Amino acid sequence: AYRFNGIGVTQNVLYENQKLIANQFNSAIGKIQDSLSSTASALGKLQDVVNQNAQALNTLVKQLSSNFGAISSVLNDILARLDKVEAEVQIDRLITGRLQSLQTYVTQQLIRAAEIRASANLAATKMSECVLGQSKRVDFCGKGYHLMSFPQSAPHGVVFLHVTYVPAQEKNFTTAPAICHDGKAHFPREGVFVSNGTHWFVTQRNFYEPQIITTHNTFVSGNCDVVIGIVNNTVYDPLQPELDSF
Amino acid sequence: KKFLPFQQFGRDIDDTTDAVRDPQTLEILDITPCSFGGVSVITPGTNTSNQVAVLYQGVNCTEVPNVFQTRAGCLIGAEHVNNSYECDIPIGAGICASYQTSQSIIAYTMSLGAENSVAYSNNSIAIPINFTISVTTEILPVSMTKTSVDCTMYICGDSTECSNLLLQYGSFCTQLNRALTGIAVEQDKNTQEVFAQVKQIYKTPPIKDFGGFNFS
Amino acid sequence: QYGSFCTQLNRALTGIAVEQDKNTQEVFAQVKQIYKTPPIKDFGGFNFSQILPDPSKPSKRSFIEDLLFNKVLICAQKFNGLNVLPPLLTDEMIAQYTSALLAGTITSGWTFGAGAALQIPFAMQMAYRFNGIGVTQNVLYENQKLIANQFNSAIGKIQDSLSSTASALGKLQDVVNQNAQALNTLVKQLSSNFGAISSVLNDILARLDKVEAEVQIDRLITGRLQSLQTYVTQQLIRAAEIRASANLAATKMSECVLGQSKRVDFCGKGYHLM
Ligand SMILES: *[C@@H]1O[C@H](CO)[C@@H](O[C@@H]2O[C@H](CO)[C@@H](O)[C@H](O)[C@H]2NC(C)=O)[C@H](O)[C@H]1NC(C)=O
Ligand SMILES: *[C@@H]1O[C@H](CO)[C@@H](O[C@@H]2O[C@H](CO)[C@@H](O)[C@H](O)[C@H]2NC(C)=O)[C@H](O)[C@H]1NC(C)=O
Ligand SMILES: *[C@@H]1O[C@H](CO)[C@@H](O[C@@H]2O[C@H](CO)[C@@H](O)[C@H](O)[C@H]2NC(C)=O)[C@H](O)[C@H]1NC(C)=O
Ligand SMILES: *[C@]1(*)O[C@H](CO)[C@@H](O[C@@H]2O[C@H](CO)[C@@H](O)[C@H](O)[C@H]2NC(C)=O)[C@H](O)[C@H]1NC(C)=O
Ligand SMILES: *[C@]1(*)O[C@H](CO)[C@@H](O[C@H]2O[C@H](CO)[C@@H](O)[C@H](O)[C@H]2NC(C)=O)[C@H](O)[C@H]1NC(C)=O
Numbered sequence A: 001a002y003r004f005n006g007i008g009v010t011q012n013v014l015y016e017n018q019k020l021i022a023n024q025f026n027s028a029i030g031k032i033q034d035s036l037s038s039t040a041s042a043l044g045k046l047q048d049v050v051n052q053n054a055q056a057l058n059t060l061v062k063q064l065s066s067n068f069g070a071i072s073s074v075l076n077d078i079l080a081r082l083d084k085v086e087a088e089v090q091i092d093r094l095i096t097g098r099l100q101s102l103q104t105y106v107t108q109q110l111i112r113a114a115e116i117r118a119s120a121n122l123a124a125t126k127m128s129e130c131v132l133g134q135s136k137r138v139d140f141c142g143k144g145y146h147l148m149s150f151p152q153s154a155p156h157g158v159v160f161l162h163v164t165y166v167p168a169q170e171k172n173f174t175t176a177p178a179i180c181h182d183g184k185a186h187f188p189r190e191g192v193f194v195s196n197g198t199h200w201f202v203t204q205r206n207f208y209e210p211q212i213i214t215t216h217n218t219f220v221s222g223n224c225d226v227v228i229g230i231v232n233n234t235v236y237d238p239l240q241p242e243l244d245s246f
Numbered sequence B: 001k002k003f004l005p006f007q008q009f010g011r012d013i014d015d016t017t018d019a020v021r022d023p024q025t026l027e028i029l030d031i032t033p034c035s036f037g038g039v040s041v042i043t044p045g046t047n048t049s050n051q052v053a054v055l056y057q058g059v060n061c062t063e064v065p066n067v068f069q070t071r072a073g074c075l076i077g078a079e080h081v082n083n084s085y086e087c088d089i090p091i092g093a094g095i096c097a098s099y100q101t102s103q104s105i106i107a108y109t110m111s112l113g114a115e116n117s118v119a120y121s122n123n124s125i126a127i128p129i130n131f132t133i134s135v136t137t138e139i140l141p142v143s144m145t146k147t148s149v150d151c152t153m154y155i156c157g158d159s160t161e162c163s164n165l166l167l168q169y170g171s172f173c174t175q176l177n178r179a180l181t182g183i184a185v186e187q188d189k190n191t192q193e194v195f196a197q198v199k200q201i202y203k204t205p206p207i208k209d210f211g212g213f214n215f216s
Numbered sequence C: 001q002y003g004s005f006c007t008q009l010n011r012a013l014t015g016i017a018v019e020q021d022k023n024t025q026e027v028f029a030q031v032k033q034i035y036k037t038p039p040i041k042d043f044g045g046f047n048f049s050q051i052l053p054d055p056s057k058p059s060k061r062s063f064i065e066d067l068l069f070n071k072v073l074i075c076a077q078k079f080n081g082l083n084v085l086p087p088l089l090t091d092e093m094i095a096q097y098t099s100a101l102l103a104g105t106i107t108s109g110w111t112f113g114a115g116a117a118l119q120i121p122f123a124m125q126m127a128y129r130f131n132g133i134g135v136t137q138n139v140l141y142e143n144q145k146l147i148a149n150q151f152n153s154a155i156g157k158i159q160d161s162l163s164s165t166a167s168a169l170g171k172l173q174d175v176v177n178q179n180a181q182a183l184n185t186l187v188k189q190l191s192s193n194f195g196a197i198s199s200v201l202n203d204i205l206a207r208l209d210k211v212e213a214e215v216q217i218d219r220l221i222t223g224r225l226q227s228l229q230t231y232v233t234q235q236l237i238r239a240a241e242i243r244a245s246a247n248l249a250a251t252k253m254s255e256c257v258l259g260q261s262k263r264v265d266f267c268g269k270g271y272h273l274m
């Protein structure tokens, strides 16, 4: 009730639809298994991480079998195949070759590990806003108005489940920015003036729920000669009838 | 181009032997290297099909040795369907190929989704009447695999006659073994930052009364 | 003999290019489906004659887009070993995604980001964007005619800040220079002895026998390898300072554009409207 109340819908939407809402979410988890049960490309991002790191080592290891300009590729070979004074010139070519092959591997890690420090810092931010509370940053926690989330572990990573609220069947209606009763304008306290064509109503902006234009849900300012789109209509008052009841 | 009476060997930008005169006569010629480009193979799943198309990059189709010259190159082995669908294997400049129905590789222009207008009016409002709670996933990397490499063994295969030479190069090893250790410590810090935001461990009660919401 | 040095470089640069396509697709392609404004225009006095696309124009760029396009050897590099691949989304498509975002933002409010694109009159919407920065709705309608003029004249001046002043587009113009700075520094490296006796392989090949050419050629190769790695490393780093710029634009395009943002001094300087 107090997480709907954070995305502009009242609490009465929840309880008056509690049994339906539970089923909508319970069945939602039903499908999320199948998006992972057989489809394997869902976990693309992590699986791409492991390949790249194991790609480096193999490229690093095979470098140990290159002449680099020397006459062989095994130190024990060249050590047991030439005297002391002439081996240094050959061995030099190997060392400078392998140094270059090792720096180049380290530099990648220095860079690549800095593209993941920018991923954890983006996860630690979501886990502190999406999970530990409700976030209103549009399209940060989900796609639609955000409700809640659930962390789930994974090998070298983390998986979220952004529960989200999304509207449905939309009905077009005639509007008016204001309503003039006795010259005085009338603005909605919170809502949009709406009409089916017959009678006028005021509703919240995210769930059709008509109400009568009473003086409680309305507040006035000035006379109706300066706004555009002003319409003529009555404004019901509830403080009159109980007086007449006497 | 015009050469003063004492000019050949026009470098003409940086170092390239561009337009040059000749012996036996006096003619100001020009030089341009022969056409070059990098071929690339666009193929669907190997199990799905063995037919492949070839994209010669950045060359006129008239110098290749059912072609369709695109802004990227000279694609050979695909039919230009006017039809517009979603991209499957991006080529470039707005051409995306795919394996569609017999069965072959086609190529076309990308379609940036569908099209519609909106019924905007001076006094018209739209209000939804229902909702669909939905569940999505986003899947974030957190840490690499903590690794390390001792230099003086990878470089010198346990040869003292090699370690003696390696010492002369200064402190190259110390730098690498410091950088990789820093990386590993950072990985531990990473994995501790994301999850350890709660000070103290909880647990659900043995009974479950959440209002109809199954978290089984 | 030097192992798989080439494979590494041609893998890194290809990764960079794929990342650039992903970047340009992340910022703009946030709307699933293309919209368009109705032929009639009744937004309450608010004149968008300069940002909405102009049909009487070869491409669909609007006026400001034309101005920005105007405010910003090409082939000698190609000959040695280089090239330039074309982007995936050409200018026409990019200038079409943007039209959708402007088209949706004015007739839908924000609800075209959450679910289906609802329809709302513009003068109604600004009432519910004032209401998000602590002022009531009555401030708007009781000042509607004045407010339109304040904004319409505001767009009047934004042309002149771009019509003649050219240092406004400093950031992008600085990007192009740096990249073209690298290639020229890379290309001129092809004319250095590096310790050898010449700088042209065809020269040294046609000026010495087989057995003695290898020692000279070695000095050239190790020299040019070092000159190529050093260029690649810059791109690996520099392209990682732009992945942190797109990710900052994709964040603004999802909060500033597709809704109202209350992060102080994120979308503007002052209370944000649209
Ligand atoms: C709301 O009702 C008032 C009262 O009928 C309207 O005021 C009249 O306006 C017409 C011109 O449109 C004049 O000819 C009448 O003399 C006015 N009557 C008066 C002053 O009492 C007003 O126009 C109506 N507004 C709308 C939106 O229908
Ligand atoms: C809102 O949507 C829900 C889910 O589609 C509707 O609930 C179903 O409505 C159909 C009839 O249209 C019934 O046969 C089902 O038994 C209902 N339950 C579910 C969850 O499937 C609900 O009626 C819709 N409400 C409105 C206002 O249209
Ligand atoms: C919106 O502003 C444009 C100018 O940016 C107006 O277009 C001009 O209108 C005048 C007067 O009709 C013409 O003489 C010009 O030739 C028009 N073109 C331009 C680009 O200068 C346009 O009329 C304005 N629209 C509204 C709704 O006021
Ligand atoms: C939470 O959902 C799970 C999965 O749907 C339910 O597990 C099923 O439990 C029944 C027995 O009640 C078994 O017969 C099924 O085989 C289980 N799995 C399947 C495939 O549905 C679990 O019971 C649910 N918890 C509650 C309290 O509803
Ligand atoms: C237009 O709106 C009116 C609102 O009054 C609808 O009329 C209804 O009014 C009462 C409920 O407020 C009830 O008596 C009925 O549900 C209904 N019909 C009658 C007899 O007035 C009306 O249906 C709407 N539709 C039209 C005709 O445009």
Ligand SMILES: *[C@@H]1O[C@H](CO)[C@@H](O)[C@H](O)[C@H]1NC(C)=O
Residues within 6 Å of the ligand: A170, A171, A172, B119
């Ligand atoms: C609103 O109008 C649009 C355009 O005519 C239409 O597509 C949509 O279905 C309408 N919605 C309803 C059901 O009122």
Ligand SMILES: *[C@@H]1O[C@H](CO)[C@@H](O)[C@H](O)[C@H]1NC(C)=O
Residues within 6 Å of the ligand: B024, B025
């Ligand atoms: C010089 O060259 C020209 C063109 O080859 C030739 O016609 C002419 O006979 C030559 N004269 C000599 C041999 O000096």
Ligand SMILES: *[C@@H]1O[C@H](CO)[C@@H](O)[C@H](O)[C@H]1NC(C)=O
Residues within 6 Å of the ligand: B060, B061, B062, B069
């Ligand atoms: C390719 O060469 C032909 C013949 O010279 C020419 O007509 C054509 O314009 C060139 N380029 C293209 C776009 O095919």
Ligand SMILES: *[C@@H]1O[C@H](CO)[C@@H](O)[C@H](O)[C@H]1NC(C)=O
Residues within 6 Å of the ligand: B122, B123, C042
């Ligand atoms: C709305 O429609 C037109 C403008 O498109 C004009 O008659 C007037 O501004 C409005 N009329 C109504 C029915 O309120």
Ligand SMILES: *[C@H]1O[C@H](CO)[C@@H](O)[C@H](O)[C@H]1NC(C)=O
Residues within 6 Å of the ligand: B044, B045, B046, B047, B048
């Ligand atoms: C083809 O599909 C099968 C079954 O999904 C899969 O195992 C195989 O790896 C695929 N090969 C491709 C995509 O070339």
Ligand SMILES: *[C@H]1O[C@H](CO)[C@@H](O)[C@H](O)[C@H]1NC(C)=O
Residues within 6 Å of the ligand: B080, B081, B082, B083
């Ligand atoms: C469709 O027609 C166009 C010419 O209008 C042609 O260029 C294109 O190749 C055709 N594609 C097919 C065969 O569907």
